[PDB]
Amino acid sequence: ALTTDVVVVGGGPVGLMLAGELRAGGVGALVLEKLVEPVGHDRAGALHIRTVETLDLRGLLDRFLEGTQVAKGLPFAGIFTQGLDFGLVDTRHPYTALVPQSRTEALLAEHAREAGAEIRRGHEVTGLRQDAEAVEVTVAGPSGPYRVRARYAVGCDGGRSTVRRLAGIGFPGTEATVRALIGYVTTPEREVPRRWERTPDGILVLAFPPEGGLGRVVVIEYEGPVTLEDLGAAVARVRGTPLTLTEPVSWLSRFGDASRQAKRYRSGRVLLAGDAAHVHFPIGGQGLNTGLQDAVNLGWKLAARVRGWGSEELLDTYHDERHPVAERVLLNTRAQLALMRPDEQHTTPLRGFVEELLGTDEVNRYFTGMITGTDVRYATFAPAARPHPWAGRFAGGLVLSGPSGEPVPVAELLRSARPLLLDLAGRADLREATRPWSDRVSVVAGEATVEPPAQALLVRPDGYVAWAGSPAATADELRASLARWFGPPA
Amino acid sequence: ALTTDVVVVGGGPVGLMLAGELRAGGVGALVLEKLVEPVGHDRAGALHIRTVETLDLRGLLDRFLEGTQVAKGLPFAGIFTQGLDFGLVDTRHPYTALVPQSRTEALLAEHAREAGAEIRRGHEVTGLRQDAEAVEVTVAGPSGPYRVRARYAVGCDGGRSTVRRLAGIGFPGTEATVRALIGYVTTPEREVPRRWERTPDGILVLAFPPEGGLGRVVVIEYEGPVTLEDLGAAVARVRGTPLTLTEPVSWLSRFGDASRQAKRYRSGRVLLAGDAAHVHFPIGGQGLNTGLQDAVNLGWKLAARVRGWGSEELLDTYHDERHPVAERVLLNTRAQLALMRPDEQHTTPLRGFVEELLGTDEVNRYFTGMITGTDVRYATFAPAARPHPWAGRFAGGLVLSGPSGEPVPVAELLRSARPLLLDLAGRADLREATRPWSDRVSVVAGEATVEPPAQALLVRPDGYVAWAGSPAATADELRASLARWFGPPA
Ligand SMILES: Cc1cc2nc3c(=O)[nH]c(=O)nc-3n(C[C@H](O)[C@H](O)[C@H](O)COP(=O)(O)OP(=O)(O)OC[C@H]3O[C@@H](n4cnc5c(N)ncnc54)[C@H](O)[C@@H]3O)c2cc1C
Numbered sequence: 004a005l006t007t008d009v010v011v012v013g014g015g016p017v018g019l020m021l022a023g024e025l026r027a028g029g030v031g032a033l034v035l036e037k038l039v040e041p042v043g044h045d046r047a048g049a050l051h052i053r054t055v056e057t058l059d060l061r062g063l064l065d066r067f068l069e070g071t072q073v074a075k076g077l078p079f080a081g082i083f084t085q086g087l088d089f090g091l092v093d094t095r096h097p098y099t100a101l102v103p104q105s106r107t108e109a110l111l112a113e114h115a116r117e118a119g120a121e122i123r124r125g126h127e128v129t130g131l132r133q134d135a136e137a138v139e140v141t142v143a144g145p146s147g148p149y150r151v152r153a154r155y156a157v158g159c160d161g162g163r164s165t166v167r168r169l170a171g172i173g174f175p176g177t178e179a180t181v182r183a184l185i186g187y188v189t190t191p192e193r194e195v196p197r198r199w200e201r202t203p204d205g206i207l208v209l210a211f212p213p214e215g216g217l218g219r220v221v222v223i224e225y226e227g228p229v230t231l232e233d234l235g236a237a238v239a240r241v242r243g244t245p246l247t248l249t250e251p252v253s254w255l256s257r258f259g260d261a262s263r264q265a266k267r268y269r270s271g272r273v274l275l276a277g278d279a280a281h282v283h284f285p286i287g288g289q290g291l292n293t294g295l296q297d298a299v300n301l302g303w304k305l306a307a308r309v310r311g312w313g314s315e316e317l318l319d320t321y322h323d324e325r326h327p328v329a330e331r332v333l334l335n336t337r338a339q340l341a342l343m344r345p346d347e348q349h350t351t352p353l354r355g356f357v358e359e360l361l362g363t364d365e366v367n368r369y370f371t372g373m374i375t376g377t378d379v380r381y382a383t384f385a386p387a388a389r390p391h392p393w394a395g396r397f398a399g400g401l402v403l404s405g406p407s408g409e410p411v412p413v414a415e416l417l418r419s420a421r422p423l424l425l426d427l428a429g430r431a432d433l434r435e436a437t438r439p440w441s442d443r444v445s446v447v448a449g450e451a452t453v454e455p456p457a458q459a460l461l462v463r464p465d466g467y468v469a470w471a472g473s474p475a476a477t478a479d480e481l482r483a484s485l486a487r488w489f490g491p492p493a
Numbered sequence: 494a495l496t497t498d499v500v501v502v503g504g505g506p507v508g509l510m511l512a513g514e515l516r517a518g519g520v521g522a523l524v525l526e527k528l529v530e531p532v533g534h535d536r537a538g539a540l541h542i543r544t545v546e547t548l549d550l551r552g553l554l555d556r557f558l559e560g561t562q563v564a565k566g567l568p569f570a571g572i573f574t575q576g577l578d579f580g581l582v583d584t585r586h587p588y589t590a591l592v593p594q595s596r597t598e599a600l601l602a603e604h605a606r607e608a609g610a611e612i613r614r615g616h617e618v619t620g621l622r623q624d625a626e627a628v629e630v631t632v633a634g635p636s637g638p639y640r641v642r643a644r645y646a647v648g649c650d651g652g653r654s655t656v657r658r659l660a661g662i663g664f665p666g667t668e669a670t671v672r673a674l675i676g677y678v679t680t681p682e683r684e685v686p687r688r689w690e691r692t693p694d695g696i697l698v699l700a701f702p703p704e705g706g707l708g709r710v711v712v713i714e715y716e717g718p719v720t721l722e723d724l725g726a727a728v729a730r731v732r733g734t735p736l737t738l739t740e741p742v743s744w745l746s747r748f749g750d751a752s753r754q755a756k757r758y759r760s761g762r763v764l765l766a767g768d769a770a771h772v773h774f775p776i777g778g779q780g781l782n783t784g785l786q787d788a789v790n791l792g793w794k795l796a797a798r799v800r801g802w803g804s805e806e807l808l809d810t811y812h813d814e815r816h817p818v819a820e821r822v823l824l825n826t827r828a829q830l831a832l833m834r835p836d837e838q839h840t841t842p843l844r845g846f847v848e849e850l851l852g853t854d855e856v857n858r859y860f861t862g863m864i865t866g867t868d869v870r871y872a873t874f875a876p877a878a879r880p881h882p883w884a885g886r887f888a889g890g891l892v893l894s895g896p897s898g899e900p901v902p903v904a905e906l907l908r909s910a911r912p913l914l915l916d917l918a919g920r921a922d923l924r925e926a927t928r929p930w931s932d933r934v935s936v937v938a939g940e941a942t943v944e945p946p947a948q949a950l951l952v953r954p955d956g957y958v959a960w961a962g963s964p965a966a967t968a969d970e971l972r973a974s975l976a977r978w979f980g981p982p983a
């Protein structure tokens with residue numbers, strides 16, 4: 004603990020989000036980032052519903068939306084006529100925010116710094132040891148190698164995670180069989196169809212202004228340096244007729260569908276988040292979404308463990324909750340690849356039937372919820388009998404009515420990163436019962452009718468419901484949940 | 494017309510069904526069959542809900558069920574845990590009848606003969622000409638070649654249809670890329686897993702008694718003579734470990750997924766039915782079902798045309814109605830092939846999600862209806878405004894209450910192969926209005942509440958609703974439908 008409470012390995016968007024969260028939880032966070040200067044990415048990032056809702060309860064949503072384009076729908080597996088309908092899901096943010104990942108990275112960096120996280124760029128982690136008392140990290144710095152001692156170390160260091168490998172955590176999954184190229188390059192052609200198309204030999208996504216010039220190319224066919232020539236050639240194989248790509252080249256890269264996940268998100272004092280914990284083909288823009296939400300899930304649990312009121316069991320719920328979520332993201336990207344397989348004989352007809360189905364609200368809601376994260380709910384600390392219908396559900400989008408009729412968004416209340424007891428129906432017995440926890444937990448009265456009904460919601464710092472009360476609920480049950488979740492009464 | 498009213502080319506199950514129907518319509522039917530003796534097939538035929546319902550209204554269902562096994566469900570695209578649920582569909586025959594096609598062929602032959610159809614075996618059709626007055630067929634018979642003159646010729650002569658080719662009707666579609674082998678052979682192995690399995694290299698379906706001996710093998714990998722050695726080898730490639738197949742061999746055959754459909758089901762005095770009209774991979778046992786229903790659709794329309802009260806327009810509704818149906822069967826078999834593709838990287842995960850979906854009633858009902866034929870309804874002779882919700886729907890499964898409370902299955906009423914006017918709510922105005930059509934159309938009073946509501950149903954000889962009356966319906970509307978469908982009043 005000598006150097007800092009928590010060392011974050013990697014200053015990508017996920018590490019920076021995690022450091023923000025740790026600071027909001029009142030503990031020290033040191034971010035060791037390998038690069039001296041951020042690289043640049045695909046400039047077409049997407050932040051989906053549940054990520055947007057999460058940013059809102061952190062008070063970050065506004066700056067993320069400054070000068071931002073949004074989308075009110077999304078195609079599924081390259082199917083556009085019957086796309087994902089954001090209106091069928093319960094949310095007050097029915098849109099995807101189109102924010103370039105580099106901007107997301109800059110914003111989170113600014114925030115993390117403003118919150119008192121120390122960021123060190125050009126410090127690469129080369130070694131990692133842990134014992135009962137603490138974690139030591141070996142870093143390549145200014146006078147060469149030095150050691151950092153901390154209570155916990157979190158690897159948010161990407162798919163090629165150093166932390167994961169050195170902690171001895173397995174990364175089971177498949178190897179890539181799909182090869183994709185993506186580039187932002189200029190072109191001498193006009194009225195070029197800005198279409199997403201399947202052909203017999205692959206997938207082509209051309210995005211060029213009708214005048215010609217800088218545009219986005221993505222080509223997919225069923226690591227290493229990419230040239231403007233490779234891109235040009237691949238486009239030809241897939242499209243049939245060659246396309247003239249020329250400089251200036253703003254970006255050239257490759258990626259594949261290797262689908263892997265850390266077997267454990269936690270090993271003693273070491274934990275993983277983001278791509279360090281899971282990799283997959285970037286279909287439907289789900290990767291960073293998952294990672295940012297990994298971080299908000301872990302941040303307050305980790306801060307609570309450091310300060311002494313979070314239990315080991317609590318910290319264990321990080322893996323138990325987030326691992327199933329990423330496992331499903333991996334499966335769905337792989338399934339989408341099957342649906343997009345370039346293949347007129349069988350897959351084209353199969354796509355016809357899927358499209359019909361997407362025209363129905365129930366199935367459409369099914370996939371919308373899957374891609375946008377709105378279907379994420381947790382099953383933590385259940386009885387032991389059955390738990391309340393609201394337990395584990397997301398409450399960050401609820402809006403109460405205050406003493407004088409004015410709205411009270413639960414999102415704005417959670418901005419302090421403290422648990423909330425929402426008293427939806429009176430229940431002064433409950434509010435009184437929570438007082439010995441007043442230092443950790445906030446009590447807030449407000450009228451609201453939810454579905455299914457609830458008289459009270461004990462809400463976690465990440466917007467999910469830890470505990471829900473029915474009329475049958477006794478103050479004693481709440482004291483039990485308060486202890487189990489948030490530690491012993493003062 | 495000199496030789497017979499209608500010549501049927503081919504004495505497979507579809508030609509024999511059609512000849513039955515033509516006889517029930519009171520016109521002459523001559524069946525020219527190439528083979529001198531029926532060959533043998535896969536002995537695991539399946540007759541699905543809508544075929545079973547059709548057999549019932551023909552009074553054939555009983556003999557088809559004599560000593561017959563039935564199934565109360567079916568897997569979809571090799572998915573068994575969440576199979577097609579027959580209970581979610583509206584029917585009083587929620588089962589598949591497992592009848593070997595050879596038995597179906599024998600029964601229809603017996604029936605066709607008992608009904609006065611002449612069957613000629615070992616007479617192959619070699620030539621076909623038509624003019625305004627009639628159709629001439631050239632046949633290879635006892636004293637060699639002879640000519641048959643008829644008003645209409647129907648090609649029910651299989652996928653390699655002579656009639657289709659000689660009539661100049663195109664057969665657009667795909668060529669086969671999937672190669673399957675199927676055989677009934679004995680084996681020296683015991684406790685052999687009677688499982689349907691996907692592997693990395695194909696699909697294997699083993700069905701052997703735990704003692705060993707005669708069993709069914711199907712192997713699928715993504716024409717010509719098959720040997721016990723070919724079978725044995727293919728099984729090895731797909732399964733990994735070789736399997737000992739030995740004589741006696743009861744059957745050995747191959748098939749593929751060539752997916753083709755006649756562009757026209759009718760060319761003047763020549764029409765097509767069954768495999769002559771459509772071919773596809775035999776996944777989900779839909780081929781003969783479609784063909785038998787093609788025949789019941791055409792039989793009474795064709796008989797009515799010959800006798801003078803069926804219009805050309807009516808006869809045209811054969812193609813208009815049945816062509817869309819087979820087109821969808823082709824698409825769904827091709828789509829199912831995509832779902833079964835042996836492929837762990839993408840298709841396995843995709844199958845997981847489809848399986849979840851099949852666990853929902855709505856989606857399950859969707860596929861059940863597709864495979865069993867229960868979703869078939871027609872859109873014929875519509876306004877011109879909107880048509881009654883019951884128009885085009887299948888009414889063969891309705892059961893009325895008679896004068897004294899006793900049930901009156903609509904299936905038993907249709908057994909005469911005459912149109913029915915069902916008076917569900919009184920409407921003596923309607924019954925009186927139908928009297929000038931009494932020679933073609935039967936009137937039957939009986940109480941029943943249907944959903945959506947209907948006061949009267951004008952029902953076709955194949956069990957589908959030609960016309961439905963609301964309270965607003967006038968006798969004049971019915972006279973109009975009666976004329977358009979069933980010809981001028983007497
Ligand atoms: C083409 C493409 C498009 C995508 N589009 C989307 C999208 O639209 N929406 C979405 O949600 N996701 C998208 N993704 C996925 C998304 O980019 C990733 O999930 C995201 O980058 C994960 O962020 P991260 O911080 O976990 O890892 P990274 O961004 O990889 O950051 C890890 C950081 O750790 C540092 N590091 C590594 N090793 C060490 C070390 N030993 N010591 C110190 N530092 C180290 C690296 O320098 C890096 O800065 C896309 C991916 C691709 C390839």
Ligand SMILES: Cc1cc2nc3c(=O)[nH]c(=O)nc-3n(C[C@H](O)[C@H](O)[C@H](O)COP(=O)(O)OP(=O)(O)OC[C@H]3O[C@@H](n4cnc5c(N)ncnc54)[C@H](O)[C@@H]3O)c2cc1C
Nearest residue numbers: 503505506507527539618650651655767768778780781782
């Ligand atoms: C392995 C397998 C399993 C199947 N399982 C099912 C199933 O479970 N359920 C289902 O509904 N379908 C199934 N099918 C499909 C089904 O068998 C066919 O759709 C069915 O045989 C079509 O019958 P048909 O009478 O139209 O054609 P056919 O059975 O091919 O009969 C055509 C007849 O025409 C004769 N003929 C051809 N040319 C001439 C000529 N020039 N002159 C005179 N006669 C001629 C032939 O001798 C033949 O008897 C399966 C198919 C296969 C391959």
